[PDB]
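Researcher: Following up on the earlier apo prediction. This time include the ligand. It's chloride ion, with the SMILES given after the sequence.
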Amino acid sequence: GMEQATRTIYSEYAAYPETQGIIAVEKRQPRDSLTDQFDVLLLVITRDPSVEWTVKHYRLNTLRVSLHLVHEQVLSRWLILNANRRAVHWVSEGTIIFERNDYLTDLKKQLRNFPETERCLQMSLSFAKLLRRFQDGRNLFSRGNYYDAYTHVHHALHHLARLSVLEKGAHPEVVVWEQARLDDPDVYKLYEQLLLSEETLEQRIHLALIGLEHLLQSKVLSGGKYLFEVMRERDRPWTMHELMEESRLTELKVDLGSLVDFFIRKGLIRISYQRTKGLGVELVTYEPV
Amino acid sequence: GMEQATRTIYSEYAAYPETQGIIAVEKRQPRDSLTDQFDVLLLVITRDPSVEWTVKHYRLNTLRVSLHLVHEQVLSRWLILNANRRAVHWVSEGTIIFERNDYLTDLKKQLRNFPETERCLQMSLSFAKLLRRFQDGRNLFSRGNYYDAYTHVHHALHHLARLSVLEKGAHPEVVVWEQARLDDPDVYKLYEQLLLSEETLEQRIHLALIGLEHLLQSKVLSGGKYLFEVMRERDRPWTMHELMEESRLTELKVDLGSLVDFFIRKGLIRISYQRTKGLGVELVTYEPVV
Ligand SMILES: [Cl-]
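Model: Understood. Below is the ligand-bound prediction.
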């Protein structure tokens, strides 16, 4: 079908030992972004060391084919972080054209599951974004910059919506407000009010910031769980550099500092100071409470 | 000063030959985000090959010090892309504690300039995101998902304000709507209409999409200029793979497919097909028009 139709394109890839799998996805309608506005999209997953992610475009007779070539480690990370909703669809709905080591058979199976570790990491990442948007919106609002405050407050609600979906054990999709209308009615209502309430712009932002601050408190443990679990893997305090250098925390580096600060203030993390023997300098240390 | 007060901390860094500069920034207020809620932030720029970007936290006597260790190429990129507003602030307002090869003195000067190539790249990146948010917004509206469409429409408008600011030759800031109030009143007014709208949710979104589609077409050349210039560096069409592999387009890889699709529909890029001799396969090829 698609296997026959694209054989002259994909066969060379199948032949290269590093290829782990080939999936084909047929357009759903014309101008499908799913298939790059082409007729068929081929996803070739490889261990080729020279590859991260690239794209090739072909036409075979009348069939226009877009080929996405992606390292197995790139795709894995996208999946783990839920950073590519298209890729998820490709794998789950796509047709297996070729595989080694049952790579795609197993991948489809794994996609029906949401490992806790992945979910919790994703919650920390969302929480971190919510916290930053909230803070910026708050600060901007204080300074009477209402149009710019509205922007951050708005983005904050969106991350909160996403977090609320994660909290209920589901992956956030592009249609998140519909997800959260049930997964979390309180969050939905805040958004509805910011958008449609009869109040003034200044008042709408104020009211949104109050609701946000409150929900932000409510969800602190959700935002921190992954971090705390990593930190407890050792029976003693961490230096900031140690946290920053920890592989399990690599995706959080950008936000670690702000998160740790917030968690200290909430009494979830303990800050101390350890002076080096023979020296004057102290290292700031952090420990989960 | 800060030099004297942090000497015990930074000295070992100044000694490492790969270190290009050390900047000190003092807190402006308590719990200053600028300095990581510490008293002094030290920024160490280094060519240490093991370094991308990392942070260390110290207390020296009573003084709490955050140390940001960043590779020169990581910083450069941040500055090229305008991806880190704090860093711009650090380098520009910061006190030079140490440097090699006038690295920091020159950097401070360079920061007063907005190179054309960097501006144009930023404009393509902004335009790329505007285009994607607009498309999602339109799609979600078509499907009756209004709360979600609003989300994308709003984001698209935010990208449009940033683009409009770049167009006038300035770096977008955190207070972009303020900047846009004068840099592009038409964009500002479209946003204002959306916020202060008394229409139905559906209607206000629909009106915002109309306005967006218009302004998008209007700024098409701002968005495509960097891409077109790179493309015209050769006198024949490009395959998609060739475009994807071109180093100058690295930052645009994620959006190149959509940008190209868009530019084809606006008549700025020409799509053709070249069949490989002896084979049935054709490579799709792209060329800027005019
Ligand atoms: Cl001892």
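Model: The beta strands of chain B are 19-26, 40-46, 53-60, 63-71, 95-99, 238-239, 269-275, 281-288.
Researcher: Noted. I'll compare it with the apo version next.
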